[PDB]
Amino acid sequence: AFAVDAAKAYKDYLASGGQPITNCVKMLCTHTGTGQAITVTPEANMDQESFGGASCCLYCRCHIDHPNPKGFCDLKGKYVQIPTTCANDPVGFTLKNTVCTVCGMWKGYGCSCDQ
Amino acid sequence: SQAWQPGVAMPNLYKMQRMLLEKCDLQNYGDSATLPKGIMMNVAKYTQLCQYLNTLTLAVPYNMRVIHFGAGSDKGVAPGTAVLRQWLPTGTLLVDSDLNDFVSDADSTLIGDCATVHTANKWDLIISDMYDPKTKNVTKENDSKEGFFTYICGFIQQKLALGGSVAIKITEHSWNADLYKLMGHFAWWTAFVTNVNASSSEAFLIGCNYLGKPREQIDGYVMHANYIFWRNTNPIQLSSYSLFDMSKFPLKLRGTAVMSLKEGQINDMILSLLSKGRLIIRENNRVVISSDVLVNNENL
Numbered sequence: 001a002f003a004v005d006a007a008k009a010y011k012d013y014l015a016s017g018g019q020p021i022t023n024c025v026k027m028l029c030t031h032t033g034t035g036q037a038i039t040v041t042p043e044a045n046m047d048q049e050s051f052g053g054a055s056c057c058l059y060c061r062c063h064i065d066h067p068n069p070k071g072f073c074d075l076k077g078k079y080v081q082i083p084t085t086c087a088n089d090p091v092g093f094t095l096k097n098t099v100c101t102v103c104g105m106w107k108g109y110g111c112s113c114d115q
Numbered sequence: 116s117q118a119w120q121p122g123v124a125m126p127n128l129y130k131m132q133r134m135l136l137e138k139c140d141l142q143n144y145g146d147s148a149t150l151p152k153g154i155m156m157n158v159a160k161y162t163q164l165c166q167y168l169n170t171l172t173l174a175v176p177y178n179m180r181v182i183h184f185g186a187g188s189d190k191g192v193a194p195g196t197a198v199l200r201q202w203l204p205t206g207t208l209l210v211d212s213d214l215n216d217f218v219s220d221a222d223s224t225l226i227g228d229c230a231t232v233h234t235a236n237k238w239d240l241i242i243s244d245m246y247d248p249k250t251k252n253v254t255k256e257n258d259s260k261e262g263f264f265t266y267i268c269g270f271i272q273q274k275l276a277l278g279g280s281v282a283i284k285i286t287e288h289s290w291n292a293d294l295y296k297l298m299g300h301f302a303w304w305t306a307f308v309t310n311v312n313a314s315s316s317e318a319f320l321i322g323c324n325y326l327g328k329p330r331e332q333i334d335g336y337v338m339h340a341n342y343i344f345w346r347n348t349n350p351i352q353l354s355s356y357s358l359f360d361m362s363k364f365p366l367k368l369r370g371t372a373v374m375s376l377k378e379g380q381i382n383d384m385i386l387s388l389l390s391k392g393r394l395i396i397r398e399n400n401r402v403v404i405s406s407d408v409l410v411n412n413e414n415l
């Protein structure tokens with residue numbers, strides 16, 4: 001029944017004022033892309049930065065197993081668009097937020113399916 | 116005008132000299148480029164390298180196979196691999212490797228000395244940023260280095276598809292004479308210096324379109340001396356200008372043709388096509404790799 005909870009541990013570390021994980025790999029791009037959350041190539045728009053996915057995944061960066069039962073990673077081998085206002089903590093961002101399964105934007109940072 | 120390029124390539128006339136090796140003395144040694152906000156040196160470096168490779172006649176087949184040695188950083192991540200994956204067509208098989216553990220966007224990653232790395236298949240593009248900082252010793256003579264350079268020369272001769280290309284990082288002290296000699300086995304070659312790292316004796320030795328046999332005979336001791344002569348007499352202005360224009364960055368998926376072929380079948384018309392970036396010669400089977408593990412029981 002025991003299972004380390006890294007997601008929760010990082011959330012609590014951040015709350016307590018800890019420094020966010022650094023050395024997330026930021027890409028050069030046009031910043032005129034689709035704005036979708038997770039893509040096969042950088043797609044940042046004017047309000048986002050694009051990052052190499054593995055470097056923004058808590059589980060990849062901490063050398064722990066991924067939540068998925070098959071262990072698959074959502075971010076590894078792809079690019080994750082992070083709002084520029086949040087790009088000081090890409091790992092925090094991808095953990096806390098979720099991607100609309102319909103339009104592919106971040107729920108709350110581009111997804112207008114709810115309007 | 117070179118400040119708007121991604122970097123500067125060795126001019127052909129310097130390649131044709133017969134200089135003696137001198138110490139490398141760069142005017143702007145210690146200076147650094149101003150990078151865009153939050154961009155790492157190694158992302159910028161690899162971006163300019165790929166920007167320069169976009170100007171060459173690279174073969175870009177469907178189901179391209181690329182391997183990247185020296186891909187880990189002291190950060191535990193793989194900035195260069197991320198640029199390569201952005202540059203290469205979607206779906207390109209990308210394998211990377213380094214001596215120490217790191218997390219990467221490559222499709223498969225092998226940890227260990229490069230000599231432990233084995234692959235069944237041939238590759239269309241080989242990138243190496245392998246480098247040992249201890250080779251830099253200004254108080255001792257600067258001789259051709261072996262180590263991973265010996266592995267790289269073997270890997271190229273045995274596992275690079277005809278028509279494929281390489282880019283291998285060297286410096287004033289990190290270099291190998293046979294690697295330069297092997298540049299003469301490509302249809303064209305150069306030493307390319309990124310504008311962001313122009314204050315360093317680093318360069319990427321690039322071989323464009325592998326032919327499997329010498330097109331020209333190169334003395335590698337002499338050619339490294341020629342390289343240092345060029346660097347010593349041609350200051351390069353640090354510049355990050357090319358990083359701000361990524362509209363044309365992606366490698367064009369040329370759909371280059373792949374053929375299996377045997378040594379007797381490589382005629383001059385084939386060699387013509389290889390030289391123009393129009394043909395890749397290798398099997399198209401499954402890509403399988405492995406790394407040797409040394410087994411030891413230290414108990415007693």
Ligand SMILES: C[S@@+](CC[C@H](N)C(=O)[O-])C[C@H]1O[C@@H](n2cnc3c(N)ncnc32)[C@H](O)[C@@H]1O
Nearest residue numbers: 157185186187188195214228229244245246263
């Ligand atoms: C200049 S750093 C690489 C930085 C990395 N390319 C990046 O994108 O940020 C040189 C790397 O080469 C590796 N290296 C040196 N000698 C090696 C060897 N014999 N086999 C495998 N890797 C080696 C080191 O572990 C080191 O990470």
Ligand SMILES: Cn1c(=O)c2ncn([C@@H]3CN(C(=O)CCN)C[C@H]3O)c2n(C)c1=O
Nearest residue numbers: 139140141142143144251253287314315316
């Ligand atoms: C790899 N590498 C270089 O490329 C380089 N280029 C210039 N320099 C310095 C400047 N120097 C002078 O001004 C000498 C006056 N007697 C000589 C060097 O100290 C360099 N150094 C130290 C280095 O290690």
Ligand SMILES: [Cl-]
Nearest residue numbers: 333334337338
């Ligand atoms: Cl020569």
Ligand code: NA
Nearest residue numbers: 174239279280
């Ligand atoms: Na190629």
Ligand code: NA
Nearest residue numbers: 251286287288
């Ligand atoms: Na050096």
Ligand SMILES: [Zn+2]
Nearest residue numbers: 057059060073
């Ligand atoms: Zn992950």
Ligand SMILES: [Zn+2]
Nearest residue numbers: 100103111113
């Ligand atoms: Zn939506």
